[PDB]
Ligand SMILES: COCCCc1nc(-c2ccc(F)cc2)c(-c2ccnc3c2CC(c2ccccc2)=N3)[nH]1
Ligand SMILES: COCCCc1nc(-c2ccc(F)cc2)c(-c2ccnc3c2CC(c2ccccc2)=N3)[nH]1
């Protein structure tokens with residue numbers, strides 16, 4: 341309510357393109373509070389345009405829900421500008437999305453990081469499930485890096501407001517059913533992305549063929565670094581019976597226990613050199629960049 | 640000790656001068672974490688040289704103290720670099736210092752902001768006193784604006800770390816803030832929490848005058864003589880007698896009759912609850928604190944740290 345600021349065009353300015361996705365263009369922008377001289381970096385998403393155009397009131401109804409998401413691992417919509425276009429405003433995260441991060445750090449990311457990211461992503465999805473919010477488009481491209489030790493799910497609620505077949509549960513492909521349990525399937529695929537340092541799922545397979553390969557029983561393969569304990573969580577996320585899939589609450593516990601002994605569940609050549617930040621590197625990161633509460637990381 | 644990151648020259652770059660003061664030069668800087676490609680904006684301060692050949696590990700010991708302060712109204716020192724210079728690193732505050740803030744926004748600043756800044760500054764100084772630290776250079780120039788609703792004290796202990804080499808009989812270009820100092824500090828270089836309280840009084844006066852220079856016209860060389868005769872800074876036109884009386888208590892010759900920071904918190908908190916009764920500012924009803932919507936927005940973008948809620952009007 342008070343959680344969503346409606347902005348006017350004259351109080352911000354887009355200065356650089358940062359990327360784009362199926363729903364809009366992402367800009368680095370500057371917020372200029374009226375009667376001030378400061379320029380405050382912000383992330384701005386200008387929505388693509390109307391598939392079926394939505395009513396202004398419906399756009400705001402949903403923007404309010406997005407602005408009400410209050411969890412250390414889900415990005416909160418901070419503001420909206422409703423003109424001839426829809427522009428979304430959120431706190432800017434300079435590290436970008438987790439998918440690019442694990443690619444650029446291929447073989448050099450420690451197991452402690454990857455299992456902690458799984459924990460955090462589950463915590464954020466668990467929070468959405470407890471609010472009865474269905475994401476519909478969880479994927480590593482929709483997970484953002486505030487700091488290497490703190491990731492956040494983004495783009496909640498856009499899919500409903502405005503197709504990633506290779507991330508979708510089978511019943512979503514067939515019937516366009518979306519539930520917290522189909523979100524769990526996407527979560528399995530997102531974890532598979534992380535553990536392959538950002539491979540494309542079903543790379544070189546045609547989207548048109550995925551429903552066939554799924555009903556056949558084939559799944560994404562066991563990542564090189566993953567012990568069978570990790571891969572079996574992924575498989576359970578991709579069972580045909582949506583109700584047999586794990587629950588996010590359980591995924592939090594499972595990955596948390598794995599992160600407490602990371603090198604037992606992930607086998608990474610070179611895990612010798614990469615660890616979590618020392619207390620001093622952690623305070624430094626947090627004091628400059630990331631002051632919000634949040635739980636402790638699993639050591 | 641895990642509170643202070645020792646930085647190598649190779650990890651950060653100064654990218655733009657922000658200002659300069661008695662203790663050094665401030666830079667907008669960019670921190671580049673080892674193995675990353677992002678550039679994290681920081682505030683860097685390159686200190687002027689100590690007036691005495693300090694051990695260099697004594698410098699680190701005083702820096703550890705500065706990195707240990709944990710309070711929403713005191714800037715924590717985050718890292719340090721010991722090379723050709725002593726360089727200090729902390730979080731960058733785009734709004735700058737409160738002195739510049741009140742000067743540029745004179746006429747647009749309401750009583751609710753002014754009384755709340757007094758509260759927060761006393762809270763920060765109360766915390767330094769609790770940590771047994773004397774600031775020695777409290778002034779509006781050393782209060783930083785995180786958001787308009789959230790100020791923080793900086794530069795504590797730099798006066799002791801760096802010293803001044805008897806530039807206390809200079810005109811005003813001196814590094815020594817004679818016009819903020821307690822009489823006993825001018826006469827005898829005595830610095831206590833109670834002399835900090837006198838400096839606190841001048842800081843309130845700066846704010847209540849929207850950034851006037853204290854004792855303007857009066858040479859600095861003459862300050863101790865006018866203070867000894869009973870002359871004090873004038874009542875700001877916006878101040879009710881109630882506010883001016885607290886400023887005068889801060890400048891009492893007898894150090895232990897000045898107010899305590901813990902009492903100034905209470906007194907200014909009480910005034911902030913009925914602000915138009917203590918400060919008379921034309922057009923004040925148009926200058927309230929931000930609506931919930933706007934402060935929610937300010938916090939999520941700029942100021943995620945936990946903070947005492949501002950004292951709203953009853
Ligand atoms: C190719 O991705 C763009 C699509 C994914 C995405 N949607 C958004 C977004 C922005 C504002 C909103 F209201 C809602 C969603 C972001 C985002 C959000 C916050 N901060 C960021 C970034 C991207 C980013 C970045 C990208 C490349 C290099 C460096 C930094 N920083 N991402
Ligand atoms: C403008 O202060 C008056 C000068 C005193 C000062 N010492 C410091 C300082 C910096 C790094 C340290 F380790 C310790 C102390 C700052 C500071 C601290 C953090 N952030 C900032 C600024 C100034 C500033 C600014 C100046 C002009 C225009 C816009 C913004 N942003 N100030």
Ligand SMILES: [Cl-]
Pocket residue numbers: 360361362363364365
């Ligand atoms: Cl997008």
Ligand SMILES: [Cl-]
Pocket residue numbers: 659660661662663
């Ligand atoms: Cl200075």
